[PDB]
Design a protein around this ligand. Sequence first.
Ligand SMILES: Cc1cc2nc3c(=O)[nH]c(=O)nc-3n(C[C@H](O)[C@H](O)[C@H](O)COP(=O)(O)OP(=O)(O)OC[C@H]3O[C@@H](n4cnc5c(N)ncnc54)[C@H](O)[C@@H]3O)c2cc1C
Length: 366
Amino acid sequence: SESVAIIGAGLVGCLAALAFSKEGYNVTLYDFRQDPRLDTTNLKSINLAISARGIDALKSIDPDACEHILQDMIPMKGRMIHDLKGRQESQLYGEAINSINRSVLNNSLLDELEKSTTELKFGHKLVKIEWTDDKQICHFAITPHTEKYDFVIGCDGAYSATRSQMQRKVEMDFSQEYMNLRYIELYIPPTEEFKPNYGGNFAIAPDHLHIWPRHKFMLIALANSDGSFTSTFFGSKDQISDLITSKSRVREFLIENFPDIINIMDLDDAVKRFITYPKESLVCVNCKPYDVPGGKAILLGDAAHAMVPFYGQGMNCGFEDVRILMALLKKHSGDRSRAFTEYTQTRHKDLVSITELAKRNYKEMS
Ligand SMILES: Cc1cc2nc3c(=O)[nH]c(=O)nc-3n(C[C@H](O)[C@H](O)[C@H](O)COP(=O)(O)OP(=O)(O)OC[C@H]3O[C@@H](n4cnc5c(N)ncnc54)[C@H](O)[C@@H]3O)c2cc1C
């Protein structure tokens, strides 16, 4: 019965914590942010698209809770393209995706954890790790604090501190790249009345991923359960910077480029969101290997392969990481040293393809 320190209570980390509690490991999930469920309190997006692969990975870890967690997801049967004239054209789907709320999926995973042996330590920032040949010494900041574990699993985001600590122990080929891409989260409220055709209070087609393809920028919309739409604008930081110098400049920009949103969105609210948007940069990372030899550490999710939003699906990719790691662990009879090794040897070549294609689709647009 071994113990594991999982650094990062995000979607990937919480899932890994669930899959390691399922197998019998004494899991201890950490995160420097407070409990997201707590009212007194880190959402990069209101919702996201989960693929069949991301769903199958959910089932492989908990078939029961899966259909309970994903009970509010909305399937997309294709893309709905809005042109400059405001005309909509449907483009049916290769791989099916479903819209699901991020905070709900995150909280649901957390709830399933507290219904198990695992232990949740929020407000614990990992600062340092020392590597022995038996147990790893994890230093936190909450006020110094230290606990020892058999192995540490990093799921602490693109700026992974776990990754940095691993680099002091292993020769890691590592590359980080900051993109010009920026995103602004907008909101399309539900209609006042139920719409028979859409099957809810939706201003537009709920079973479609709406896209407003423009030159070097983009608007998208995913349906929420309550009828509203989570909307996201994608563009370079330069374009946005030039826009937000004037409320009228932003307002006239939206009307000109997305004329068919005037009936479904308050422009004054979108202008406000544009100007006061968190100017947070997007970074892409690649690692090799993802594991410390001896099976003492491993990287999953954005910590290992952070990629471009929309063009790449990081959550689905992160979920697939966990499922493959479990297949290997249950193929090598719990031998983490041999399982973590085969992970890198097989997962890296897939991740190289995925991240590059996503990066290639992005550079194409911009
Ligand atoms: C706008 C947007 C839209 C997206 N849409 C999709 C989509 O539709 N489909 C899809 O598959 N993906 C999508 N993604 C990507 C997806 O959100 C991420 O790839 C996914 O959340 C990865 O989760 P993670 O747990 O690996 O990293 P994170 O979500 O960042 O989790 C890391 C956690 O670790 C914690 N942490 C950080 N540092 C420390 C530390 N030093 N000590 C302790 N804890 C720490 C943080 O608090 C954080 O909660 C989107 C991303 C963005 C930005």
